[PDB]
Amino acid sequence: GSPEFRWTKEEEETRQMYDMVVKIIDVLRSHNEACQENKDLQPYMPIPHVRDSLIQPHDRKKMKKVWDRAVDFLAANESRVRTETRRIGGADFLVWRWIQPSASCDKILVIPSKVWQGQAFHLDRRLERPHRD
Known part of the structure; x- marks a missing residue:
């Protein structure tokens, strides 16, 4: 019945909580730096991409059940992937995908408040901001 705001002090609540979540906040913040370079390096993945990601082998799921609680810590400060309900094979499930x-x-408003080179181009070379590596 009220929003979160989410500024510098909201971190003081989450600080001590980070134990298992520090691996998943690392998964999202890490894939992100390589991702803003490219379009989205992750276009669609399941809930288990991130829920298997807490551990790699046969013991993979053993902290995916803990993840149910870990999200209480994540969700007060970070969501560096997008949540969507999408139809696959004629069926609608919940998946996590890259932002x-x-x-x-980058965009221009009513008053073009920039100088010549730094950012992109204008009129000539109608592409997007990130390019082929």
């Missing part, structure tokens, strides 16, 4: 902040998200 990358900075470098891609």
Whole structure:
């Protein structure tokens, strides 16, 4: 019945909580830096891409059940992938997919408040901001 705001102090609540989540906040913040370069390096993945990611082999799921609680810590400060309900094979399930902040998200408003070179181009060379490596 109220929003979160999410500024610098909201971290003081989450600090001590980070134990198992530090691996998954590492998975999302890490894949992100390579992702803003490219379009989205992850276009669609399941809930287990991130829920298997806490551990790699046969013991993979053993902290995916803990993840149910770990999300209480994540969700007060970070969501560096997008949540969507999507239809696959005629059936609608919940999947997690990539959103990358900075470098891609650039635009011009009513007053073109920029100088010649630094950012992109204008009129000539009608592409997007990130390019082929």
